[PDB]
Amino acid sequence: HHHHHHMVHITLDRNTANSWLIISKDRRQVRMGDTHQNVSDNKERFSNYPMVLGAQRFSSGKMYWEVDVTQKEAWDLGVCRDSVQRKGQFSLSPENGFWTIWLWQDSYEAGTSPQTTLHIQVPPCQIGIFVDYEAGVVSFYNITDHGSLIYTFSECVFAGPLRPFFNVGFNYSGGNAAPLKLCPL
Numbered sequence: 001h002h003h004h005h006h007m008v009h010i011t012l013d014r015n016t017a018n019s020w021l022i023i024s025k026d027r028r029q030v031r032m033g034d035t036h037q038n039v040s041d042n043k044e045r046f047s048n049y050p051m052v053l054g055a056q057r058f059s060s061g062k063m064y065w066e067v068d069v070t071q072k073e074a075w076d077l078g079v080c081r082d083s084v085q086r087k088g089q090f091s092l093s094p095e096n097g098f099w100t101i102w103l104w105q106d107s108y109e110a111g112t113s114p115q116t117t118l119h120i121q122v123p124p125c126q127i128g129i130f131v132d133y134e135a136g137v138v139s140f141y142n143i144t145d146h147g148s149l150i151y152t153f154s155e156c157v158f159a160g161p162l163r164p165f166f167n168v169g170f171n172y173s174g175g176n177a178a179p180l181k182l183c184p185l
């Protein structure tokens with residue numbers, strides 16, 4: 001792909017984080033803690049899942065960023081509406097305001113409803129995410145495999161400002177402690 005020139009500097013918004021997440025000083029890395037991280041509750045925090053939003057809001061233009069997923073067993077990545085549900089249980093779908101892909105149990109899937117099987121020969125260590133607001137497109141790229149396309153959501157109905165979306169996943173197995181990291185431009 002040739003989307004690299006739309007690169008944006010994403011930082012994580014601590015106030016939206018699930019209370020077990022640990023975000024680095026530079027706000028560029030996040031991991032699952034093994035306990036509550038001693039923060040007060042607020043209406044922005046994702047309560048049920050290890051999720052956090054980017055601070056940036058996008059309402060126009062073309063945007064690109066990259067995320068490092070090295071040695072993780074489970075995660076979700078993409079974008080979401082600023083007004084997605086924070087509390088209780090929900091599925092990641094465009095109907096609920098999410099445009100995402102994930103790794104779970106050794107398979108990759110796009111967060112359509114129902115979910116769509118992805119075809120990835122080279123397990124990615126870094127994922128590229130491209131948003132074209134005007135066109136209604138969210139695309140995902142395998143940076144480990146020379147930028148090959150993973151998935152394109154088209155005919156998106158964003159219906160609001162968009163925020164970068166992250167889920168570090170649970171660590172029930174003891175094999176999923178590694179962080180998500182925003183990669184440098």
Ligand SMILES: O=C(c1csnn1)N1CCOCC1
Binds near residue numbers: 019047048050
């Ligand atoms: O259920 C758990 C849990 C215990 S161990 N893994 N996570 N929660 C509830 C949702 O916020 C994160 C902590």
Ligand SMILES: O=C(c1csnn1)N1CCOCC1
Binds near residue numbers: 095154155
């Ligand atoms: O945004 C939507 C949408 C809103 S409700 N269901 N459809 N999408 C996402 C991109 O793939 C096509 C459908």
